[PDB]
Structures are given as structure tokens and as C-alpha cells.
mmCIF file of C-alpha atoms in Angstrom:
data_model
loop_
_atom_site.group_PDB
_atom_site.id
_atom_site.type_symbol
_atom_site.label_atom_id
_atom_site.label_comp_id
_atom_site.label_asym_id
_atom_site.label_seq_id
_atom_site.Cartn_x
_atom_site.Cartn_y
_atom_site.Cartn_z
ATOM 1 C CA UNK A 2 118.246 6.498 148.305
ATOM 2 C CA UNK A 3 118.610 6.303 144.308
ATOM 3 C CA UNK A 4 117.046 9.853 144.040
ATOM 4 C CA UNK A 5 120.337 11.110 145.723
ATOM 5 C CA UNK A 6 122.397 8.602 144.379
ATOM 6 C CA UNK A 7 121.703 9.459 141.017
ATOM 7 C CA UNK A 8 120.854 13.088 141.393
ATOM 8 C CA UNK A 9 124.121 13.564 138.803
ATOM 9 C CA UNK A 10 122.641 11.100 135.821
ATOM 10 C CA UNK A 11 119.063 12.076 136.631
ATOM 11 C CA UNK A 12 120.428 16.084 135.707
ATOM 12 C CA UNK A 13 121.848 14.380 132.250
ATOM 13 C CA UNK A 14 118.841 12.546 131.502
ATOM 14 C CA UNK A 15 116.880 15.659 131.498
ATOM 15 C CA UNK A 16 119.086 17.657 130.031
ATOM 16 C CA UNK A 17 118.601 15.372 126.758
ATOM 17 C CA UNK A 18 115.224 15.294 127.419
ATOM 18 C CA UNK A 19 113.963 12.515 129.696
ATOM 19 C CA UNK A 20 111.717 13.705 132.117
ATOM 20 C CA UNK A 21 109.856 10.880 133.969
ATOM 21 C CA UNK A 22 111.911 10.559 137.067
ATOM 22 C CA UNK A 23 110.139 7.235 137.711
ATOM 23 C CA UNK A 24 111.180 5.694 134.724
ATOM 24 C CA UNK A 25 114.285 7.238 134.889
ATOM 25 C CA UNK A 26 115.302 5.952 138.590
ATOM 26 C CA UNK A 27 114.161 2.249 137.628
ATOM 27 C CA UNK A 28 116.375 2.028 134.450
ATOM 28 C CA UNK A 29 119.408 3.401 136.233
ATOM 29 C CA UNK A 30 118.862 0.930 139.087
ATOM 30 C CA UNK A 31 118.405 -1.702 136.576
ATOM 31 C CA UNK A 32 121.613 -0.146 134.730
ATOM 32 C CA UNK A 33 123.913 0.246 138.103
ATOM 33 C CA UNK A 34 124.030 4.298 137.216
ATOM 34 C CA UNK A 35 124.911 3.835 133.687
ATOM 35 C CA UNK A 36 123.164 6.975 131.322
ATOM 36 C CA UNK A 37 124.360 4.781 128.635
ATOM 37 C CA UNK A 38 123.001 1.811 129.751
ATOM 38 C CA UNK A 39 120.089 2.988 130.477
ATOM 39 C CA UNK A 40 119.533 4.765 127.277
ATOM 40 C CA UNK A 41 117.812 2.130 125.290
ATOM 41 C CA UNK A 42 114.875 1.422 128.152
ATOM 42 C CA UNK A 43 114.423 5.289 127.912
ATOM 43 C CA UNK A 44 114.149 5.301 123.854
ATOM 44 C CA UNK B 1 126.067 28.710 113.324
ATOM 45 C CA UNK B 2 127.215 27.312 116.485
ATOM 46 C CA UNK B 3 125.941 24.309 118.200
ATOM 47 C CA UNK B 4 127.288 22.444 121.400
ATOM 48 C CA UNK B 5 127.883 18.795 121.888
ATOM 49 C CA UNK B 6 128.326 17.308 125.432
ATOM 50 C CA UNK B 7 129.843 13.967 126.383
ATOM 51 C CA UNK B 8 128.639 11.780 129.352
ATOM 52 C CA UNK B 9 131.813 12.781 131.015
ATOM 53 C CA UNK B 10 131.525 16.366 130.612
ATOM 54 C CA UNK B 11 133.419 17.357 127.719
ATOM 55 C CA UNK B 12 131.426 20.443 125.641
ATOM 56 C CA UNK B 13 132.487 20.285 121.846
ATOM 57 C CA UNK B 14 131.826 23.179 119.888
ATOM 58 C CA UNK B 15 131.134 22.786 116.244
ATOM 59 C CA UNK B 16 130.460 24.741 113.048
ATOM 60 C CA UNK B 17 127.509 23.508 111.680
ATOM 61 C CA UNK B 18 124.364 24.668 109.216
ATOM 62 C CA UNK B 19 120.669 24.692 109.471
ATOM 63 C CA UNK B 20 120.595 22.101 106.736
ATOM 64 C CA UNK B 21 123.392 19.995 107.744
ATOM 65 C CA UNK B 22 122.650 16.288 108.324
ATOM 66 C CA UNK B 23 122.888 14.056 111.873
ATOM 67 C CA UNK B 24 125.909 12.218 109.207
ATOM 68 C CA UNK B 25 127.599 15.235 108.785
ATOM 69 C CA UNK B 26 127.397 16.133 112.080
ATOM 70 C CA UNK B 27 128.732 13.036 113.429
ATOM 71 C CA UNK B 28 131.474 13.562 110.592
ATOM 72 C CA UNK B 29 132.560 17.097 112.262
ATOM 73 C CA UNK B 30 132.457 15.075 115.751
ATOM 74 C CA UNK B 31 135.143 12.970 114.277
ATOM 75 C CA UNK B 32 137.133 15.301 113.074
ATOM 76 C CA UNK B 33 137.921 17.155 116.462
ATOM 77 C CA UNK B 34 137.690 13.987 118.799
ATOM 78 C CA UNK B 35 138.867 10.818 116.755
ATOM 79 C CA UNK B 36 134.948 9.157 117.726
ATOM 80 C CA UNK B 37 134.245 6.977 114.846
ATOM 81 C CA UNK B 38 130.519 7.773 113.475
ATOM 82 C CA UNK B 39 129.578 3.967 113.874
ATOM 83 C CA UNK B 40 129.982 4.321 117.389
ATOM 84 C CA UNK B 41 127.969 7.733 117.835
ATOM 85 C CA UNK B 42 124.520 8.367 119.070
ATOM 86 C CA UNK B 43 123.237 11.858 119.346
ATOM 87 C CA UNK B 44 119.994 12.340 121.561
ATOM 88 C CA UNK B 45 118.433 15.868 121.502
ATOM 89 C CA UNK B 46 114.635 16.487 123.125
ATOM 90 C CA UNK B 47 114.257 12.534 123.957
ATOM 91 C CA UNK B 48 115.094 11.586 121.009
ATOM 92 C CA UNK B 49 117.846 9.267 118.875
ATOM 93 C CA UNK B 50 118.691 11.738 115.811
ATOM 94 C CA UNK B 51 118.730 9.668 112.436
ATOM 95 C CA UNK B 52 121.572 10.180 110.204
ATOM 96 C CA UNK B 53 119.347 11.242 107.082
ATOM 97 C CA UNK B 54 117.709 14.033 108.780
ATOM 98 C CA UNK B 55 118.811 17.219 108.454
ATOM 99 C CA UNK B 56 119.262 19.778 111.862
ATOM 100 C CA UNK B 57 116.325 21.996 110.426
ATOM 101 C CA UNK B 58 114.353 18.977 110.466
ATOM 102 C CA UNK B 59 114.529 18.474 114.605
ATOM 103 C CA UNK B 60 114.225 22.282 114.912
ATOM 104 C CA UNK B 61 118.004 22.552 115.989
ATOM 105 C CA UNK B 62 118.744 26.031 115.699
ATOM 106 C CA UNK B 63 121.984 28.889 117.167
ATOM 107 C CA UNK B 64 123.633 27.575 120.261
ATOM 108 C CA UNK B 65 121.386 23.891 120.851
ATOM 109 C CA UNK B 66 123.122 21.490 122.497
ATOM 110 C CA UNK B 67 122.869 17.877 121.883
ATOM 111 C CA UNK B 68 124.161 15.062 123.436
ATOM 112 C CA UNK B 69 126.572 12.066 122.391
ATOM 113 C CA UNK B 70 126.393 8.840 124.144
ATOM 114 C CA UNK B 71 128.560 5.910 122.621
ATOM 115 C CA UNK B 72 127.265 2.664 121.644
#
């Protein structure tokens, strides 16, 4: 499950301030778990 | 003041900073204690890119913050 899988990246998106876990889930999918990656879908 | 800067790995650097410092001198300090070049820096505090001509009064970054420094 990517909620689970990601649980450590979803902590470190919040942390800087991301907060929709939907959003958040898809781009890291769509990133293969990369914060950095994913960072410019999120901005 | 004080203000924290984490890496994605986990690495907290602490740095001496002032209320009207810029995001340029901040990424200056970050190169001084890690070797990052400032090119390569992004800082994201609150959901948000910080822009090099902005000061840390200006995104209300105040004693103790922490912001966050993902590479390019």
C-alpha cells in the first residue's frame, strides 16, 4: 500500500509543508519515492 | 539567531543567521559548513520555494525555524 510505503517521505513532505496526502501519494508514485522528484508536481 | 536546516537524508545543520538575512545569504552560510554549491540549493519552508532576494523576515522565519534543502 503506498500510504505505508511512503509513510517516511509523506512525514518530510509535511514537515516542509505539503499537506494533501492525495496529491502527495500520486506524485511519489509517479516519482518511485523520490521527495525530490516529486517536489516540482507539489510546487 | 538560530535556525535549522534539514537534508532529505537526515542531516540537521545549524546556522547563525539574522532576521534580515537573505535566502542568498543563507544558501551562502549552507556552503560554507557543507561544500553545497548555492546553484544547486533549494530551500522549501511552509510549501513554499524561498527566492534568493527575499529576506527571512519576509517569510516570517523567526528563532529556531527549520527549513528544508532539497538539491536540484
Amino acid at each position: 500500500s503506498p500510504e505505508e510505503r511512503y509513510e517516511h517521505q509523506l512525514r518530510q513532505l509535511n514537515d516542509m509543508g505539503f499537506f494533501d496526502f492525495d496529491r502527495n501519494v500520486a506524485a511519489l508514485r509517479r516519482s518511485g519515492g523520490s521527495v525530490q522528484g516529486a517536489l516540482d508536481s507539489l510546487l | 539567531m538560530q535556525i535549522f536546516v534539514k537534508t532529505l537524508t537526515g542531516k540537521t545543520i545549524t546556522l547563525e543567521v539574522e532576521p534580515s538575512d537573505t535566502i542568498e545569504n543563507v544558501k551562502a552560510k549552507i556552503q560554507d559548513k557543507e561544500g553545497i554549491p548555492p546553484d544547486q540549493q533549494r530551500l522549501i519552508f511552509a510549501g513554499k520555494q524561498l527566492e534568493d532576494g527575499r529576506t527571512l523576515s519576509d517569510y516570517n522565519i523567526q528563532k529556531e525555524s527549520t527549513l528544508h534543502l532539497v538539491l536540484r
